[PDB]
Design a protein around this ligand. Structure first.
Ligand SMILES: [Mg+2]
Ligand SMILES: [Mg+2]
Ligand SMILES: [Mg+2]
Lengths: 334, 106, 348, 335, 351
């Protein structure tokens, strides 16, 4: 049974390479790829579109693949996993995409199978970060020509892990812009975006941790399918996963306090408004009281008979206003 | 050439006082400023390095601080054996430069 | 190892530790390839002869308030007294223990009701021995109807093969019907987020904290489900017979996925309290702005109405072109400059 | 196409510094044509175009030196992070310079571009004012080994001077960190919070600038394209190490300023208590007094408001009595 | 990553090895040569008297306290064959735990914490371990450590330690460090308890400052503990030739300890995160009581002044104001409305 919500397209791409030359093809007929596995030289087999379970079960039967890992391939919600069998190695990894002006993380599951000298790839969309390895194969760069299919699996996993660094850079930029907005533009859209970023980072924290385990398995177990001498390369990828995990949790540590920063900024703004109200009230209500003292209607009242008494009252009010505002200026409030 | 001019050029105080000597640097030496004590006729003795750290064996009387490009040396409680010329030094660059001195006298 | 000693209780008695004391029913399914027999017995004697019967049997005992029945079964079926105490003890965390003859399993059920965001917990316990599955549950209403109708229809490999598939079927049904409740709660929290974005009223705090406590209980339940499935899968006890190791590995992965989901959803929930605090702080800021502007315009105007409203024997009234409209215009001008200042500072 | 983006349109000049193994030639010119024949000379030359708002000059040099039209967009696009691009005939590097004014704590960016073509290097600047005076002195005065070396060493010398100026920037930022730290600890004020926000923004800009620079230097020494040459690799590794130092310092300073912000920021909501205490005490003291003043100032023509015992001073003393009672009621709750 | 070499530092002569710490007071070297036969303890300040112990067959424990003496570290590194970059990492305190494997030795970096009371501070000291054949070199900054139990076991032949080789000594030292991490965690739990009390019972600025200090302490604790988990995992999985095959289960036990420690730190982080909201709610409660006092006063007194103004206007055009009264009505209305407002505040209790 199929699970992915992606059903638009279906394609197959095959690459065969050796020291002498490389054979790059592309077709849709499943029957053309059957004679490709038996070649001694390493070959790369890629099938796109998991909705059509017929071709999946056909290649599973043809390649001697168990139906259980086929069910795993069809399922998309499965977290990353590695399973070692005598004929073939089954690995599950995810692919992430992030964009600007809109805050969405999309996960495209990619399943890798290593057997003989052929690597099988399963994915949903068209387009992936496996272009640098393709360019290295086709343009005779690096040592990929001199190596076997396990080194091709290394190249694929290395590129997939390397794209995580670019994802982290984009998320760091978004974290920076949110930090600024939280610090000085406190609004509701800010809160919504902070929530969205927190959820996305929790999803990445979910995905990246099993990646460490699935790389450690290829690092340490080394079943005879891994031709050895390539273990240090998997060591490098394991270290890269360590770095990605550290960076991800640093990001989540920042994001946790973003909202507290926002709440304190809102408190600061309402404090400013409160300061304005307090200053005006405390320099005005006492003066209103002073004015009301003289406004009382009594038959006899001392100081109603004084040379320019009303100017003296106004001067007294001016004096008290000046001393109050001087006290506030000392307080730094105004 | 970073110039350090520390003041006063001479200080007069008794025991039990809080004697403060301040050093001013023309450029921005990060924090590499040290203080030395020189009784006349003897080699200088290192007291505070990194502008705030007390060297091992120096009495806890002396202290150092920094707020910007200016550094301060404070003796919390002067004692008769703390009467000597005090200098200020920067080692931010490989061309070290000294202050001109300050003679604490009775 | 023997029954724990309680201060209030007499030395040996076993006490039910629940709230449900309404119903008592026993369901016994002796399912087999040749045929199956189903019947409900109100008394406990009928289930006893199936202690050593070769054919697998499935005994569903509903109502644990009758401690008599439970300890009669325990004495008859060889269950140790401490296992009986933990069967009665509903206030418990899911766990499994391995014995020489039987496997004891504890794992809970949850039900959800509309208009009342309450998460229940039914203590259902499983006992695996010989070829018998003994089930003790608090009240009528179970989540194992699909497995029962699958046995009755004869469909599936569970009827043809041994009873360890029956235990696996029960556990899989329980984990599966966690998902109906989980889907209901997810729909509820999504719609609740809809109103909190629309209307941040007083009840929102109570509802969000109720959901947070619900998640805390779900975590306290789900985390013990591993180290239970962990023991069942890795430890491979002899009663498993090693035929069902992948049927435990898949449930292991399922439980790990559920634990990861609850770990994510806890932070998802806390974000809701954060958003609510944001909205209430903004509302308070708006109230402050309104009050401050009203007071700020209307207090100097009271200065005018008081200072000139004074009565004095010799006041420089100095009526100039009937200056009372002049003073009114002065108040108007100061009010206009104040509201202009407020607009420029963007408080209003 | 190929329109200048920055905000500088005043300064324009073209400068060539052709140095040889035993000879030296230097001049400043204003016409693009005179510097064109220096492309084919064997001895390395340094060509500087300090005003790139004059688009035609940039097009002329790009067409004369045969560089791809794509690099021209980045040359004229000042708002861009540092980067490096390796092409068959040349390497294109985008870098930046920074100037910090201590009087007004603001950070200004100025883009520069470097193109290494065989036996020459080209430099494009938005305005006048470069951090490359020491390399000019070293070239002119036959000190160091830049005179004995090729144009790749010139690219080295320019990048080394750049990172040295980065160190000089970090010194002044260190001074600002110190002063702001002591202000925030002992003198809480609005100006300190505004300064802290400015400093945090400046450090964010520095981080986003310095990390691409580190990747540029790493690409420069590890990949070592044919124009870089074998002998100059250790020098590029040294500059990579200097960039590592700068990045570590930037992260430390950014952490310090975030920690500075946090304490004051959570110290809010205790200012609310003080403000409301002041408002409540002033309102409680002066509202009932105004009420009674209005009551006894209210006229009705039938009141017992005849003086009897002189009552205006009596009512004022009563005002004082309730005022003192209210103040005594305060400070009982230690407000 | 390619080959490794000393990174060039600007402002320093090339190849210079510099101590990047804060402690300059102490210097000491301890030697503990032990076997099933006898132990030979030794404490000195001479580096030339420990170098012969390189070729000892019996297990040796050399502990050099005080790495501000860069000359001693360089001499030991040259004599023992340690690479200069490992010496640079030894003297680089501003680092995080790591493990490096070479042909002839194992290099490990750990951390020591000492939580202090009456000054809520978590300070760290870097400790380096080099496992060379039969020797275990230890580098420390200041006097004071957590390896007294191992010293007692060596002294009294208690336990298995004296029967085994030097890799068991490395086990024992790492286990002692991880054990003291538990005491550190207990101290921090007590601090969290005290702070969570102080947040509610007396909320002030120092409480939130202490809360932020504790939160950053927890952050650096995690930044330290995660590489510890990684290094123990590497030690018992990669298991280089220097580590014997009989020692791995002990490293497994230490690894499980590290995992438990990490879980404890995560729970502490959650609690400290909630402490901020608790503090904000408490201070808002106090502000609420102040606010309600203000509201009660204003509500009682503003309408009364409004009514006074109503009957205080000299509107002489109408004889309504000229009503023969002894002032019963207006004062009675003010009194009854005031007491009505007061009892209205008694219900929905504000006080
Ligand atoms: Mg508020
Ligand atoms: Mg009147
Ligand atoms: Mg009034």
């Amino acid at each position: 049974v199929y699970t992915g919500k992606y059903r638009e397209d279906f394609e197959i791409e095959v690459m065969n390479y050796s020291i002498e030359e490389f054979r790059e093809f592309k077709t849709t007929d499943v029957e053309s790829v059957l004679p490709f596995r038996d070649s001694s030289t390493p070959t790369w087999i890629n099938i796109t579109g998991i909705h059509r379970t017929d071709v999946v079960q056909r290649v599973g039967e043809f390649f001697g693949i168990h139906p259980l890992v086929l069910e795993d391939i069809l399922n998309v919600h499965q977290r990353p996993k590695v399973e070692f069998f005598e004929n073939y190695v089954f690995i599950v990894l995810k692919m992430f995409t992030y964009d600007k002006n809109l805050h969405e993380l999309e996960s495209e599951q990619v399943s890798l199978i290593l057997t003989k000298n052929c690597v099988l790839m399963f994915q949903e969309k068209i387009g992936d970060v496996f272009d640098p390895v393709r360019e290295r194969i086709r343009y005779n760069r690096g040592i990929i020509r001199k190596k076997r299919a396990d080194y091709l699996l290394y190249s694929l996993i290395d590129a997939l892990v390397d794209d995580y660094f670019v994802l982290l850079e984009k998320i760091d930029d978004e974290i920076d812009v949110l930090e600024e907005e939280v610090l000085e533009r406190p609004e509701k859209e800010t809160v919504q975006r902070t929530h969205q970023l927190k959820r996305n980072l929790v999803e990445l924290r979910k995905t990246i941790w099993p990646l460490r385990e699935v790389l450690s398995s290829l690092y340490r177990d080394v079943p005879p399918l891994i031709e050895k001498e390539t273990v240090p390369y998997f060591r490098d990828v394991y270290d890269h996963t360590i770095q990605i995990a550290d960076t991800v949790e640093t990001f989540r540590d920042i994001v946790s306090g973003l909202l507290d920063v926002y709440l304190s900024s809102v408190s600061n703004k309402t404090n400013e408004v409160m300061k304005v109200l307090t200053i005006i009230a405390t320099i005005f209500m006492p003066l209103t009281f002073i004015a009301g003292i003289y406004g009382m209607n009594f038959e006899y009242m001392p100081e109603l008979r004084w040379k320019w008494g009303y100017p003296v009252v106004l001067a007294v009010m001016g004096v008290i206003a000046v001393i109050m505002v001087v006290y506030f200026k000392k307080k730094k409030w105004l | 050439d970073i110039q350090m001019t520390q003041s006063p050029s001479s200080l007069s105080a008794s025991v039990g006082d809080r004697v403060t000597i301040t050093c001013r640097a023309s450029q921005s030496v990060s924090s590499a400023v040290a203080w030395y004590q020189q009784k006349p006729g003897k080699a200088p003795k290192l007291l505070i390095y990194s502008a705030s750290s007390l060297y091992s064996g120096v009495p806890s009387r002396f202290s150092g601080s920094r707020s910007g490009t200016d550094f301060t040396l404070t003796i919390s409680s002067l004692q008769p054996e703390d009467f000597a010329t005090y200098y200020c030094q920067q080692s931010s660059s490989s061309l070290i430069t000294f202050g001109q001195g300050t003679k604490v006298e009775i």
